[PDB]
Amino acid sequence: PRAKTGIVRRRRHKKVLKRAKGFWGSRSKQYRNAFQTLLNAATYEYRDRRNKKRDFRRLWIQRINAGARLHGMNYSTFINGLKRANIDLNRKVLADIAAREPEAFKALVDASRNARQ
């Protein structure tokens, strides 16, 4: 008995083309370029998952550095005197405190400096 593709291929293909939208030109419309575009897209997804884990960390950091400096502290010195008084805060939170909660950041500062000297 013979068994044409009949259906399967159109199936596979559409799957890709439905992943494949928003894509500029041919990419969103022809299979090969679509599936392809998606190979690379794969690479970018994986890496950029861990990557965003980096990037956010960076962001939090610069916000804290700011905070410290807003009084007279370095990031490194603030964070270090916040290791010294053992104030074991996540730094994401520290950003949050720093930019949305003023006088709190103030206190955490005075603390870090105290524990530093």
Binding site for RNA (CB under 7 A): 1-15, 18, 21-33, 35-41, 44-53, 55-58, 60-62, 65, 74-76, 83, 90-92
Q: Minimal distance in Å, beta carbon 53 to RNA? A: 5
By beta-carbon proximity to RNA, the closer residue of 91 and 106 is: 91
> Which tokens in the block code for residue 28?
């969103």
Report which secondary-structure segment, H or E, holds 73. none
Q: Minimal distance in Å, beta carbon 30 to RNA? A: 3
Q: Minimal distance in Å, beta carbon 110 to RNA? A: 18
Helices (H), 2-116: 8-19, 31-69, 75-84, 91-100, 102-116
Sign of CA dihedral 109, 103, 99, 72: negative
By beta-carbon proximity to RNA, the closer residue of 51 and 114 is: 51
Say how many residues make up the chain. Answer: 117
